[PDB]
């Protein structure tokens, strides 16, 4: 085999994990991005707060997802890095804990997000979408039955490549992330909401 990683997938660090009052007022805002007045997708630019994946190639970086850190752990989808190790700034950060059904993975310690939600309150996706500053956006999930019990979910609004963004309560806590994909009896595909499941 080689000793080297097969991709080199980069963490960069691009906001704070909060619900924003000014998304609350308007239904979208921008966020302090640090000040950063354009994002390059291309360029590449561990604390707490809402991280993009970038995968080099020859061309340069490509925003593939996007995750979360909290208390010692990276949060992101399955699909974006199907437990590839990840890099940032120097340090290597590795898989501990996934749920491909959930379309889960964690790195550097089991899940940590305790966001809430229940019927009719809303959250703000925190979305970092590739070639975009991020933007808090207001909504409000809808209600799903499961095969085992229920699910909230949101729509899926953003690019793809926002996967692994955070979806925040009003406490600041991550319900759930954005882009785990999952298909309705009707045939719509929505993103449904982690910590909402009732199993």
Same mark, same amino acid.
């Given at each position: ?29 921008? +966020? ?20 993009? +994946?970038?995968?080099? =190639? ?9 995750? @979360? ?23 290597? +950060? ?5 749920? @491909? ?8 310690? =089991? ?42 979910? @949101? ?45």
């Amino acid at each position: 085999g080689s000793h080297m990683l097969e991709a080199d997938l980069e963490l960069e660090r691009a906001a704070d994990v909060r619900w924003e009052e000014q998304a609350e007022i308007s239904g979208s805002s921008p +966020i302090l991005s640090i000040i950063k007045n354009e994002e390059e997708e291309q360029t590449l630019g561990l604390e707490d707060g809402a991280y993009r +994946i970038k995968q080099k =190639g020859i061309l340069g970086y490509s925003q593939i997802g996007a995750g @979360v850190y909290k208390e010692g752990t990276f949060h992101t989808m399955w699909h974006v890095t199907r437990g590839a190790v990840l890099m940032h700034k120097g340090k290597r +950060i590795e898989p501990s804990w996934a749920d @491909v059904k959930k379309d889960l993975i964690s790195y550097g310690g =089991g899940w940590k997000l305790e966001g809430e939600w229940k019927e009719g309150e809303e959250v703000q996706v925190l979305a970092l979408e590739p070639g975009k500053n991020p933007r808090a956006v207001q909504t409000k999930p809808g209600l799903f039955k499961t095969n085992t019990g229920t699910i909230g979910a @949101v729509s899926l609004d953003f690019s793809p490549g926002t996967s692994g963004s955070p979806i925040v309560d009003k406490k600041g806590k991550v319900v759930g992330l954005y882009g785990n994909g999952v298909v309705t009896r009707s045939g719509a595909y929505v993103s449904a909401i982690a910590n909402t499941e009732k199993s």
